[PDB]
């Protein structure tokens, strides 16, 4: 693996609801560079299932347009780690959250990697961004993006 | 203006020679996002003139290819500030350099802005990157990119 920061005592039910992708970082530039880059995904809502799986609603630019997407992250034996199914095993880790303001996560498959700082409101949270940059110093990131409140209220952060 | 960090006692003649754009940051995502983004420029060599102007040799992706470019930054009454001529006055500021290892600069024209961390060798200089991130905390950056030694040895950081 690469990420080695997870949240202890995570209650997944408590991450339900509205989120904003305030910032994103990735191990490779091409993961985040254009609007249609593979990991350029904007989180809209987290919906944990009664069984403790996590449905994710996001927006993604595909074929010159901002498309909705609904994804399932299946629980593992580790509360802070989930699995999306693909041609390749892709792992979601929750690094840190306070439920009410911010949540940091990374997704990972040379191993590749993207992380975001999620926030509850269309506001620049300097404190959440601090924690995001601290978490990222452990990691081989090569691109970082952040969004302003105006963009945060547009579909696909236009 | 926006940038408010310049190097005191700058000797421009001493920045002559080979440089590598190790990292870049900008105030707007669209300034750096694709390979043909307007401020995605890779520095190759600095050539200060006897009169104290600064010629810059760089590479830039334009029309699906990595083109060379030669640019003149004309001196001002301030040693650490130079001017490129365009439809709009565009200002180059030297923030910090030690001549032998690293140099930080910003270019600026809502005012927009891009900065790079230049290094003498195709090596990841953690120390130069520290200084770059410190300088950038004063600034409204929204995209940051960094390159690995393999890319640093390819034209247009391929
Ligand atoms: C607890 C935070 C969980 C957020 C997880 C976001 C995972 C989305 C990854 C989807 C990858 C790109 C989308 C796709 O093309 O399928
Ligand atoms: C002392 C460091 C000076 C480095 C200055 C680099 C200035 C290059 C800016 C050129 C902007 C894009 C190129 C172009 O399209 O003309």
Swiss-Prot record, chains A, B:
It comes from the Eukaryota. The keyword Disulfide bond applies. SUPFAM superfamilies: Lipocalins (SSF50814). Disulfide bonds join 66-156, 106-115, 106-117. GO terms for cellular component: extracellular region. Pfam families: Lipocalin (PF00061). Alternate disulfide bonds occur in equal amounts in all variants examined. GO terms for molecular function: identical protein binding; long-chain fatty acid binding; retinol binding. Primary component of whey, it binds retinol and is probably involved in the transport of that molecule. Under physiological conditions beta-lactoglobulin exists as an equilibrium mixture of monomeric and dimeric forms. Interaction with LMBR1L which mediates the endocytosis of LGB has been observed in PubMed:17991420, but not in PubMed:23964685. Belongs to the calycin superfamily. Lipocalin family. This is Beta-lactoglobulin. It comes from Bos taurus. The gene is LGB.
